[PDB]
């Protein structure tokens, strides 16, 4: 049959594409969920977090969704919003780029733009208060702490690199942001598929929130150009109980790396597909993984070479 | 296995989605060449054409790629050449934007500028002059007229067609600007697989020159918006005897149908995806198309809602 209702289903079946200057001996495979709707792993939960709520009876035909994201959820809730004809409200600082702009309310997103001075805390304080005003009617789908994010990656992302691996997969390398792909991932591997992998958070060195909590120090965000990870605190989403290891990259490097993959590869990948690049390359090139098969997560795909 | 040794493999095996606010009871599925490496599909014949090369001895190591076109096709020629490690040059006219020239330039293409003034011609020009300079080093493709264009249409994107649609695909809609795509997907629905199809060539009324063609009428190209489209001449790529009907739509409709695309559909698609969903609607909205499934091959997608 192979036809798609709507381009909410059309989710996932993403790559696996052997590195040749990265690892040792093409030990380092990247996913390219740039190959999805919306061109990120957004996607998924997007998808999902909708589905879920359309079961769970939370979500109905005629209540509204609302969420403050302007990053790669949005675009993803904007694009199945418009599959499923829901109407959205994004909620956004004023200051945020026409492109993005442009991009949502063509999608058709109801766009509420919030003081330039609160920033993002502005917009979800407002996200909240639109809520709140009319709780029957308005939907927020919470991505940090929505289950429906890690179980899509345990349904599909994880499966999909078992399957696609002849689970010869050894180690998964993935950046932090919601924590879900990690996490839904690392469950599928090790749980359904009882392989004891090797399961890598990736972090900026500028906000290492994940390994200073671990490591028993004082929690200290940071600034940072990773767009996508290093949200400045542990999401419930995060299941630290499946991290084996957490490595660190700093935006410079990331940057340089994500630069790499498309001259020296020919991947056109975000700053944060570099970071888990960079992360995976240090890792491949230890001895102790050597004879290992290494996936790393490139999380989106960048229009514009951060040049 | 199921592991890519590099990007240029990865081609293909794009949705397949079916339309919700367009044709009669869904009787429109729409492709999504937009899911692939450089998110055209120009990746089909960037990865072909210098396939073929090789085999036949044509491209070596250390022979050059040189071609002059800075559209979907140069993407997928220079990541190609960025995934296979050749050297290429993209030659453009002086005046063309900043983020394609990052773009290639951050794909790791050598870019020669041409003078604005002569326009494309200016570029195709030079690209033969750096090739008459010394033939035996460079090598250009010539998307136009190299079977190996329509070739890999025949070979994935037909077939992908056929084994997605259980072999129900009955009309096949696709804008023309190499021909490739229509040519390659027809040969192998009609006569690989044995099915006598409806064919349908799509062009902008502003520049229908197979129309003024077929019709004996004088050959007038012109302006307009459908980028993608309507090069203002019959490729060599273009079969005319596996076309069965031409169909002819304006700018504005492209780009309304490429808005509701996305607004309507939660489908993020070019120019030229609205221009052959446009097509495909009025055709399906006659009761002789009624009963008919038709496949529209959305070429791009748009990074940038044209807004």
Redesign the interface.
Same mark, same amino acid.
């Given at each position: 049959?192979?036809?798609?209702?709507? @381009?909410?289903? *059309?989710i996932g @079946?993403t790559?696996?594409?052997?590195l040749?200057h990265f690892g040792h001996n093409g030990n380092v495979?990247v996913k390219?969920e740039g %190959? @999805?709707? *919306?061109?990120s792993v957004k996607c998924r939960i997007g998808a999902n977090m909708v589905w879920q709520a359309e079961k769970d009876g939370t979500l109905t035909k005629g209540k509204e969704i609302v969420e403050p994201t302007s990053g790669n959820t949005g675009i993803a809730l !904007?694009?199945? !919003?418009?599959? %499923?004809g829901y109407k959205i409200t994004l909620t956004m600082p004023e200051t945020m780029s026409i492109?993005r702009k442009?991009?949502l309310?063509?999608?058709?997103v109801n766009l509420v733009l919030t003081e330039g001075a609160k920033g993002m805390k502005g917009a979800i304080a407002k996200a909240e208060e639109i809520v709140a005003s009319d709780p029957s009617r308005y939907v927020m789908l919470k991505q940090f702490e929505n289950p429906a994010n890690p179980q899509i990656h345990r349904e599909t992302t994880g499966p999909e690199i078992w399957? =696609?691996? =002849?689970g010869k997969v050894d180690v998964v390398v993935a950046g932090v942001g919601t924590g879900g792909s990690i996490t839904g991932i690392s469950r599928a591997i090790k749980l359904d598929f009882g392989k004891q992998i090797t399961s890598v958070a990736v972090e900026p060195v500028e906000s290492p929130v994940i390994s200073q909590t671990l490591a028993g120090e004082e929690v200290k965000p940071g600034p940072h150009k990773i767009q996508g990870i290093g949200a400045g605190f542990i999401p419930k989403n995060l299941d630290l109980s499946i991290i084996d290891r957490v490595e660190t990259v700093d935006s410079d490097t990331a940057l340089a790396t994500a %630069?790499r993959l498309?001259?020296?590869?020919?991947?056109?990948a975000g700053i944060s597909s570099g970071a888990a690049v960079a992360a995976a390359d240090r890792l491949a090139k230890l001895p102790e993984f050597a004879d290992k098969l290494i996936v790393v997560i490139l999380p989106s *795909?960048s229009? %514009?070479?951060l040049?």
């Open positions: 049959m192979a036809i798609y209702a709507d @381009n909410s289903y *059309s @079946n790559p696996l594409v052997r040749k495979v390219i %190959r @999805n709707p *919306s061109y !904007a694009y199945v !919003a418009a599959a %499923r492109e442009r991009l309310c063509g999608l058709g399957k =696609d691996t =002849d %630069r498309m001259a020296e590869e020919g991947i056109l *795909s229009e %514009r070479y040049s």
